[PDB]
Symmetry: C2
Subunit: 229 residues, 2 copies
């Protein structure tokens, strides 16, 4: 059996993102997988990295250093419960899918705040244990991104550059760094200008791809993959 | 000179190395006689989430909420939440916007990502058409002043992290150039926590020193080739 966590960042259940999340739940549930969804906006998930993320008393209450404080908090079981709740889902998961609209070539700030606050030192990475040896190694991660821009805008010589170029900080700098093997991203280009069909083809392709997600090999998550020819 | 600067600052700790870079900027720019404003996001408890609370008028489509459509509308009607319009005023007046922050996950801290997502709305920062070189903030300068955990050597093409310019792309091109800014070369202060106390003073005064001649700089060519090479 396998466990999947979907971390989902869209305000509107009727959205194209909402339908992609909902077919993932339906298809992975149909296969017998254990599925959990973190619907960040419904949870009013806190995005800011602050001293509230530590309960009881700080390791150095003269000069606040978020990284050191959350590292010590993790080790002393002193993190806020919204964070540890997410860490439990991630620890149990075999695959983590992030489902979100591209905001400013990146994730919406609420999902950025999940990455900043959930993936702390001791949990997701340490000295050592990063990139290849990151603490989440053995787990799979997958970005399912929707865009306002069309596929042609996202080419090396198009106005937006190649899609892979905006993937680097998320796939390499975040998911690889924590040890994830990164599945190929699912990019649903410009759903809002596509037809009622086309949109169906995109959703159905996603549902279709999920049918054989466990047979996939991860991308080689390298500078060459993102930037080379 | 007769110029206005906005510093958008994202760090929790006033005694931090970011706190020092922000204050040296304020001291040097104020010394030159520039007009200076700082948006200290954590101290303001700045709201990062893009939600329907950012619009206070009748929604264009209250059956199916589309944040970009509703905020674009709300900007035209003046029904945006006032935290957002308070920032727009600072940006509209500024000739240079400096972002001061620690690198978090190859990007800005979520509180600052939220400032970008909610403040740079359609109608204000760009339109369709009216983006990249035609973006609505054309004529303004922006500059990322980023600190890292990683050393410079780490952030080279054959270092573990890849070249520093790679992680600049979403921010410089995808956000600031998109809105029309000309982008000045980034100030990257590498690995201050590892550096010696004297190498730290050196990085602070190197930023101070650069600001002395900031108005004479040309912007970078904010292209794929600048960021990625051939
Ligand atoms: C702050 C901000 C920053 C942005 N930055 C970027 C950026 O850097 N680059 C970029 O390219 N874009 C950017 N965008 C645009 C954004 O990425 C797109 O708006 C978003 O990806 C569209 O996805 P959605 O789910 O919201 O679309 P929706 O509008 O919800 O989807 C399109 C249509 O499909 C309908 N639908 C729902 N379910 C289904 C289904 N079952 N089958 C068929 N249709 C269905 C919807 O109701 C809708 O009519 C930005 C947007 C914002 C607000
Ligand atoms: C969630 C998260 C994600 C991160 N992701 C990344 C990443 O992707 N890539 C990466 O490289 N790093 C990353 N980091 C590390 C982060 O970028 C660095 O910790 C940050 O850049 C260091 O800057 P700071 O101001 O907090 O340093 P500080 O810890 O405040 O400063 C270091 C030292 O400089 C001293 N100092 C303060 N003022 C002065 C002064 N006037 N003169 C001389 N010294 C002074 C301080 O007192 C301190 O001792 C991440 C950190 C976190 C918390
Ligand atoms: C650039 O130096 C580095 C590089 C790292 O990873 C590449 C680090 C750390 C620290 C302190 C903790 C940690 O978990 N990692 C993962 C570091 O600081 C010494
Ligand atoms: C801020 O909103 C943005 C930002 C963008 O880029 C950073 C966008 C778009 C759309 C619709 C198409 C597109 O290609 N890009 C590149 C967008 O929607 C208006
Ligand atoms: C999540 O925290 C992170 C994440 C990183 O990369 C994504 C880091 C580092 C540090 C300290 C050095 C570094 O080179 N990288 C590359 C870090 O600090 C522990
Ligand atoms: Zn990688
Ligand atoms: Zn550019």
């Amino acid at each position: 059996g396998k466990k999947v966590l979907i971390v989902y960042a869209h305000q509107e259940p009727k959205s194209f993102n909402g339908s992609l999340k909902n077919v993932a739940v339906d298809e992975l549930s149909r296969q017998g997988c254990t599925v959990t969804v973190s619907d960040l906006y419904a949870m009013n998930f806190e995005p800011r990295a602050t001293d509230k993320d530590i309960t009881g008393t700080l390791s150095n209450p003269e000069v606040f250093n978020y990284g050191v404080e959350t590292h010590e908090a993790y080790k002393q079981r002193s993190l806020a419960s919204d964070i540890t709740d997410e860490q439990k889902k991630v620890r149990e998961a075999d695959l983590v899918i992030f489902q979100f609209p591209l905001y400013w070539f990146s994730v919406p700030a609420i999902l950025k705040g999940w990455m900043d606050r959930v993936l702390c030192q001791g949990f997701a990475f340490d000295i050592p244990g990063f990139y290849d040896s990151g603490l989440l190694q053995g787990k799979l991660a997958l970005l399912s991104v929707t865009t306002g821009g069309t596929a042609e805008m996202y080419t090396k010589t198009g106005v937006n550059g190649d899609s892979r170029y905006f993937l680097w900080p998320l796939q390499h700098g975040t998911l690889h760094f924590c040890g994830f093997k990164v599945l190929a991203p699912q990019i649903s280009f410009a759903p809002e200008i596509a037809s009622e069909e086309e949109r169906k083809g995109m959703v159905a392709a996603w549902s279709q791809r999920l049918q054989t997600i466990w047979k996939e090999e991860p991308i080689p998550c390298t500078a060459h993959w993102h930037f080379g020819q």
